[PDB]
Amino acid sequence: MGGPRVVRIVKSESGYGFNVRGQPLQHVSAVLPGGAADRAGVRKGDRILEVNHVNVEGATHKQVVDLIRAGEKELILTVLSVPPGSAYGSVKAYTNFDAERDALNIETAIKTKGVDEVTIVNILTNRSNEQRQDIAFAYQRRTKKELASALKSALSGHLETVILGLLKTPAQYDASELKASMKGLGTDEDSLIEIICSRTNQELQEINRVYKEMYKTDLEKDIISDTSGDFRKLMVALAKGRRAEDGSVIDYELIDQDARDLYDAGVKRKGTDVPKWISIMTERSVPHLQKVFDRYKSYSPYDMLESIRKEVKGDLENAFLNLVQCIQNKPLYFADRLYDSMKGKGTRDKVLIRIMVSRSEVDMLKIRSEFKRKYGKSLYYYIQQDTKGDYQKALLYLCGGDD
Amino acid sequence: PPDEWV
Ligand SMILES: [Ca+2]
Ligand SMILES: [Ca+2]
Ligand SMILES: [Ca+2]
Ligand SMILES: [Ca+2]
Ligand SMILES: [Ca+2]
């Protein structure tokens, strides 16, 4: 049935972004993805019980709409939801969130003599990504300046990279990182492989759509322009995000045949049948490939990762090693990349920042668990020893705590 | 059924 809960939609000049329908309580029939209502927690099927603290039981459809459209400011709704996931992310939605309050406090920190970077970090790294979008809209509405552009001018160094990354939606951030990894002579293959190998179907579908809107070209077309050989074939196949979905039935016969084919195409023979590896590892569901990799050990003297190191080299080897890691244990995969970015001289800040930003609301808690288990000390500890200043503090907030 | 976007 759903308990009466309060959602707070920020003032939006383009509309709150949800459809009111009814016949008695009016219900929400559809929600614009990424719109103001979507970010505040309004979901499909919500029955509207109060609009800005007035009970609308028995009101007409026009009256509920007119009450919603009246103030032209924020929209506080009391909704009854069909009782319905970011449960392992470090950054949670801030309770008692007020975008206007945060926007004004952020502008105060920007206008503070010398720029109050501390307050900017304390706010933005302790709000969810959707809450940051609400702040950005309220900021522009009161300053007539875009928040990202204002923060670009106020901040610098690695802290600027972090803050600007947090302000983008997940699909916008991934799309811009992909573009940055391909733009310019050559390519950051490691950045391209990390994103393409680790993102799921749903994520890649939104990345492809957002990439096309941001840059007016297909992501697949830019991957082709900047890659070649079997590496291109693998990246193009993964980037389509059309992997088979996790099924209810375990296909034990296919698991065995897939494991034989991987062996026959690689260790068993001289050379490698690279397209056979690509077909199996990009088309089968992740739970399927997990069991394929264990069954593969029944035929091969080396496991899947070791077989890759012996068969292929270069970018293709890197891509296969990253992909198999993501299929086997993705939190452990990111934990190892985090360790690699800090273990030696200096810091691979680009990698550290991108992981802390993109995984903060996905599986950072599992990343921290795999990290502490494998390396003995916390991810928090390594960030402290490798980074300094407000830049360090923002990364520590994205981490979420010690251990 | 009446509907409208807001
Ligand atoms: Ca300062
Ligand atoms: Ca700057
Ligand atoms: Ca290039
Ligand atoms: Ca071979
Ligand atoms: Ca270091």
Residue numbers in the entry:
A (entry chain A): 38 to 60, 77 to 137, 142 to 460
B (entry chain B): 77 to 82
Sentences from the paper on this structure:
The human proteome comprises 266 human PDZ (PSD95/DLG1/ZO1) domains 16 and about 4000 putative PBMs, defining a network of one million potential interactions. PBMs are mostly (though not exclusively) C-terminal, with their COO- implicated in binding, and are classified based on position −2, being respectively Ser/Thr, hydrophobic or acidic in classes 1, 2, and 3 17,18. PDZ-PBM interactions are rather transient and promiscuous. Viral proteins bearing functional PBMs are found notably in HPV and HTLV oncoviruses as well as in HBV, WNV and coronaviruses including MERS or SARS-CoV213,15,23–26.
According to its logo, SNX27 normally prefers class-1 PBMs, with Thr or Ser at p-2. Yet, SNX27 also binds (pKd = 4.56) to the class-3 PBM of MERS E viral protein, with Glu at p-2. The structure of SNX27 bound to the PBM of MERS E shows a p-1 Trp of MERS E interacting with a hydrophobic groove of SNX27 including its β2-β3 sheets and a Leu side-chain from its β3-α1 loop. MERS E has a class 3 PBM (Glu at p-2) with poor match to SNX27 logo; yet MERS E binds relatively well to SNX27. In the SNX27/MERS E complex Trp at p-1 of MERS E establishes favorable hydrophobic contacts. We found out that the closest interactomic neighbor of MERS E based on Euclidian distances of our explored interactome is a class-1 PBM, ARVCF. While ARVCF is a class 1 PBM with a p-2 Ser, it also possesses a Trp residue at p-1, similarly to MERS E. The p-1 Trp thus stands out as the major PDZ-binding specificity determinant for MERS E and ARVCF PBMs, more relevant than the class-determining p-2. While the nature of the antepenultimate p-2 residue is useful for classifying PBMs, it is not fully operative for predicting their PDZ-binding specificities.
